[PDB]
Design a protein around this motif. Structure first.
Motif, PDB file in Angstrom:
ATOM      1  N   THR A  53       0.836  -1.201   0.000  1.00  0.00           N
ATOM      2  CA  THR A  53       0.000   0.000   0.000  1.00  0.00           C
ATOM      3  C   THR A  53       0.865   1.243   0.000  1.00  0.00           C
ATOM      4  OG1 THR A  53      -0.180   0.233   2.379  1.00  0.00           O
ATOM      5  CG2 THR A  53      -1.758  -1.255   1.298  1.00  0.00           C
ATOM      6  N   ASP A  54       0.206   2.368  -0.301  1.00  0.00           N
ATOM      7  CA  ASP A  54       0.862   3.665  -0.196  1.00  0.00           C
ATOM      8  C   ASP A  54       1.313   3.938   1.229  1.00  0.00           C
ATOM      9  OD1 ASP A  54       0.570   4.371  -2.952  1.00  0.00           O
ATOM     10  OD2 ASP A  54      -1.398   5.288  -2.547  1.00  0.00           O
ATOM     11  N   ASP A  55       0.441   3.700   2.215  1.00  0.00           N
ATOM     12  CA  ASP A  55       0.805   3.967   3.610  1.00  0.00           C
ATOM     13  C   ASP A  55       2.022   3.155   4.041  1.00  0.00           C
ATOM     14  OD1 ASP A  55      -1.272   5.732   3.884  1.00  0.00           O
ATOM     15  OD2 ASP A  55      -2.469   4.488   5.223  1.00  0.00           O
ATOM     16  N   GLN A  56       2.066   1.881   3.651  1.00  0.00           N
ATOM     17  CA  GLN A  56       3.210   1.044   4.004  1.00  0.00           C
ATOM     18  C   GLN A  56       4.461   1.531   3.294  1.00  0.00           C
ATOM     19  OE1 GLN A  56       1.857  -2.730   2.784  1.00  0.00           O
ATOM     20  NE2 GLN A  56       0.631  -3.122   4.599  1.00  0.00           N
ATOM     21  N   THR A  57       4.317   1.997   2.049  1.00  0.00           N
ATOM     22  CA  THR A  57       5.466   2.450   1.283  1.00  0.00           C
ATOM     23  C   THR A  57       6.021   3.736   1.856  1.00  0.00           C
ATOM     24  OG1 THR A  57       4.664   1.285  -0.660  1.00  0.00           O
ATOM     25  CG2 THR A  57       6.240   3.042  -1.038  1.00  0.00           C
ATOM     26  N   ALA A  58       5.138   4.640   2.294  1.00  0.00           N
ATOM     27  CA  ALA A  58       5.581   5.830   3.033  1.00  0.00           C
ATOM     28  C   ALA A  58       6.345   5.438   4.293  1.00  0.00           C
ATOM     29  CB  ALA A  58       4.380   6.734   3.382  1.00  0.00           C
ATOM     30  N   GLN A  59       5.915   4.367   4.971  1.00  0.00           N
ATOM     31  CA  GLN A  59       6.661   3.888   6.130  1.00  0.00           C
ATOM     32  C   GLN A  59       8.039   3.354   5.753  1.00  0.00           C
ATOM     33  OE1 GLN A  59       6.074   4.704   9.157  1.00  0.00           O
ATOM     34  NE2 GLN A  59       4.778   3.151  10.124  1.00  0.00           N
ATOM     35  N   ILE A  60       8.174   2.711   4.592  1.00  0.00           N
ATOM     36  CA  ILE A  60       9.516   2.344   4.128  1.00  0.00           C
ATOM     37  C   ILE A  60      10.383   3.584   4.024  1.00  0.00           C
ATOM     38  CG2 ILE A  60      10.905   1.511   2.194  1.00  0.00           C
ATOM     39  CD1 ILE A  60       8.579  -0.449   1.602  1.00  0.00           C
ATOM     40  N   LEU A  61       9.835   4.652   3.440  1.00  0.00           N
ATOM     41  CA  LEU A  61      10.615   5.881   3.294  1.00  0.00           C
ATOM     42  C   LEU A  61      10.971   6.464   4.654  1.00  0.00           C
ATOM     43  CD1 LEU A  61       8.812   7.473   0.239  1.00  0.00           C
ATOM     44  CD2 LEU A  61      10.769   5.885   0.255  1.00  0.00           C
ATOM     45  N   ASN A  62      10.065   6.369   5.627  1.00  0.00           N
ATOM     46  CA  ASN A  62      10.368   6.842   6.976  1.00  0.00           C
ATOM     47  C   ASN A  62      11.476   6.028   7.621  1.00  0.00           C
ATOM     48  OD1 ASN A  62       8.289   8.715   6.668  1.00  0.00           O
ATOM     49  ND2 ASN A  62       6.783   7.381   7.684  1.00  0.00           N
ATOM     50  N   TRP A  63      11.451   4.705   7.442  1.00  0.00           N
ATOM     51  CA  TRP A  63      12.530   3.878   7.959  1.00  0.00           C
ATOM     52  C   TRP A  63      13.864   4.272   7.340  1.00  0.00           C
ATOM     53  CZ3 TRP A  63      16.161   0.671   5.888  1.00  0.00           C
ATOM     54  CH2 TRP A  63      16.859  -0.150   6.783  1.00  0.00           C
ATOM     55  N   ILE A  64      13.887   4.487   6.024  1.00  0.00           N
ATOM     56  CA  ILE A  64      15.105   4.902   5.331  1.00  0.00           C
ATOM     57  C   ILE A  64      15.614   6.206   5.928  1.00  0.00           C
ATOM     58  CG2 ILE A  64      16.088   5.687   3.144  1.00  0.00           C
ATOM     59  CD1 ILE A  64      14.163   3.613   1.757  1.00  0.00           C
ATOM     60  N   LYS A  65      14.709   7.157   6.169  1.00  0.00           N
ATOM     61  CA  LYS A  65      15.143   8.439   6.715  1.00  0.00           C
ATOM     62  C   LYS A  65      15.777   8.252   8.086  1.00  0.00           C
ATOM     63  CE  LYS A  65      14.695  13.148   7.271  1.00  0.00           C
ATOM     64  NZ  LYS A  65      16.131  13.555   7.414  1.00  0.00           N
ATOM     65  N   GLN A  66      15.209   7.361   8.900  1.00  0.00           N
ATOM     66  CA  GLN A  66      15.696   7.132  10.265  1.00  0.00           C
ATOM     67  C   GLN A  66      16.999   6.342  10.285  1.00  0.00           C
ATOM     68  OE1 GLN A  66      12.991   5.734  13.549  1.00  0.00           O
ATOM     69  NE2 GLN A  66      14.226   3.860  13.525  1.00  0.00           N
ATOM     70  N   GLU A  67      17.106   5.282   9.471  1.00  0.00           N
ATOM     71  CA  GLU A  67      18.217   4.347   9.567  1.00  0.00           C
ATOM     72  C   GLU A  67      19.359   4.637   8.613  1.00  0.00           C
ATOM     73  OE1 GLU A  67      18.614   2.236  11.889  1.00  0.00           O
ATOM     74  OE2 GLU A  67      16.617   2.348  12.805  1.00  0.00           O
ATOM     75  N   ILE A  68      19.107   5.322   7.508  1.00  0.00           N
ATOM     76  CA  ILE A  68      20.128   5.612   6.512  1.00  0.00           C
ATOM     77  C   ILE A  68      20.323   7.108   6.341  1.00  0.00           C
ATOM     78  CG2 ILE A  68      20.950   5.271   4.196  1.00  0.00           C
ATOM     79  CD1 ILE A  68      19.138   2.661   4.133  1.00  0.00           C
ATOM     80  N   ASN A  69      19.232   7.849   6.214  1.00  0.00           N
ATOM     81  CA  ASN A  69      19.257   9.310   6.170  1.00  0.00           C
ATOM     82  C   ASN A  69      20.018   9.827   4.951  1.00  0.00           C
ATOM     83  OD1 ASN A  69      18.599  11.917   6.997  1.00  0.00           O
ATOM     84  ND2 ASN A  69      20.463  12.120   8.254  1.00  0.00           N
ATOM     85  N   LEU A  70      19.725   9.242   3.796  1.00  0.00           N
ATOM     86  CA  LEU A  70      20.198   9.708   2.505  1.00  0.00           C
ATOM     87  C   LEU A  70      19.027   9.703   1.546  1.00  0.00           C
ATOM     88  CD1 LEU A  70      23.474   7.636   2.299  1.00  0.00           C
ATOM     89  CD2 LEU A  70      23.365  10.126   2.621  1.00  0.00           C
ATOM     90  N   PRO A  71      19.091  10.493   0.487  1.00  0.00           N
ATOM     91  CA  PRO A  71      17.961  10.555  -0.450  1.00  0.00           C
ATOM     92  C   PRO A  71      17.759   9.258  -1.228  1.00  0.00           C
ATOM     93  CG  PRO A  71      19.846  11.826  -1.284  1.00  0.00           C
ATOM     94  CD  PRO A  71      20.179  11.432   0.137  1.00  0.00           C
ATOM     95  N   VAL A  72      16.497   8.993  -1.561  1.00  0.00           N
ATOM     96  CA  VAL A  72      16.139   7.844  -2.380  1.00  0.00           C
ATOM     97  C   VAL A  72      16.137   8.275  -3.836  1.00  0.00           C
ATOM     98  CG1 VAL A  72      14.436   6.100  -2.907  1.00  0.00           C
ATOM     99  CG2 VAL A  72      14.788   6.795  -0.534  1.00  0.00           C
TER     100      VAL A  72
END
Ligand SMILES: C[C@H](CS)C(=O)N1CCCC[C@@H]1C(=O)O
Ligand SMILES: [Zn+2]
Ligand SMILES: [Zn+2]
Length: 229
Positions: A53-72
């Motif tokens: 889903t969109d909501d779950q995919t936004a959560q993937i992006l949030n995890w990336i921001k928290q754990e990696i903190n680089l642009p996708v």
């Protein structure tokens, strides 16, 4: 280990590679897991497959921001079914460039998906035409032939032992290939073997609906697809 982040699960597979897992209650089948990948390439992040889903995919992006903190920098999705493309609007809302097999983009509306922004095309030998996958870094995209669907594609990660079979490959102890209403029953077995041959040194085979496995996943899938012809 399995890092729980909301309703999603993240597992590191290599220094620069993580598996994302999301779940959808699909009535009649239980709460079905689907896996994709997150790859850091230097100062940017590359995503393989959305969540359901969109909501779950936004959560993937949030995890990336928290754990990696680089642009996708980009995402590539591996066929036009919901587990791989269901969150396209979330990627677009975030400004992320998206890629799929031309055929996946063609099929997306009728399958209920939003198309990716860019279309990949493939040479006769299955390797992506390089101009259609610009700036893909270590992602090596391969069309193995029709199988699980007509449009399924696969991705290897250079500098690792990892290749991603998406929904084409099942684990070495799966007992069916699932629904085949979109499957190419004649060609499925050859396609599975072609994926293994394109990534001959990959020892960790990542797939959508099982945990990562050895190369025995590829031969077991192909054995079962033999029984559809
Ligand atoms: C939404 C996914 C897209 S692959 C899907 O339709 N499936 C996965 C999980 C089990 C049922 C079914 C299958 O057997 O293929
Ligand atoms: Zn599918
Ligand atoms: Zn699937």
């Amino acid at each position: 280990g399995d890092q729980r982040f909301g309703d999603l699960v993240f597992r590191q597979l290599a220094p620069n590679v993580w598996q994302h897992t999301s779940y959808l209650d699909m009535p009649g089948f239980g709460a079905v897991a689907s896996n994709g990948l997150i790859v850091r390439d230097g100062g940017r992040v590359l995503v393989v497959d959305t969540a359901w889903t969109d909501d779950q995919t936004a959560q993937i992006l949030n995890w990336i921001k928290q754990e990696i903190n680089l642009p996708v920098a980009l995402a590539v999705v591996t066929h036009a079914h919901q587990d791989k493309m269901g969150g396209m609007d979330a990627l677009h809302a975030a400004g992320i460039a998206t890629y799929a097999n031309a055929l996946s983009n063609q099929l997306a509306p009728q399958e209920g998906m939003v198309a990716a922004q860019h279309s990949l095309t493939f040479a006769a030998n299955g390797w992506v035409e390089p101009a259609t996958a610009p700036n893909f870094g270590p992602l090596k995209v391969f069309y193995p032939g029709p199988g699980h669907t007509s449009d399924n594609i696969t991705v290897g990660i250079d500098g690792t032992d990892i290749a991603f079979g998406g929904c084409l490959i099942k684990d070495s102890k799966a007992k069916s290939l699932g629904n085949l209403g979109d499957a190419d029953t004649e060609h499925y077995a050859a396609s599975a073997r072609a994926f293994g041959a394109a990534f001959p040194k990959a020892s960790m085979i990542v797939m959508s609906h099982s945990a990562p496995d050895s190369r025995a996943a590829i031969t077991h899938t192909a054995r079962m697809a033999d029984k559809l012809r």
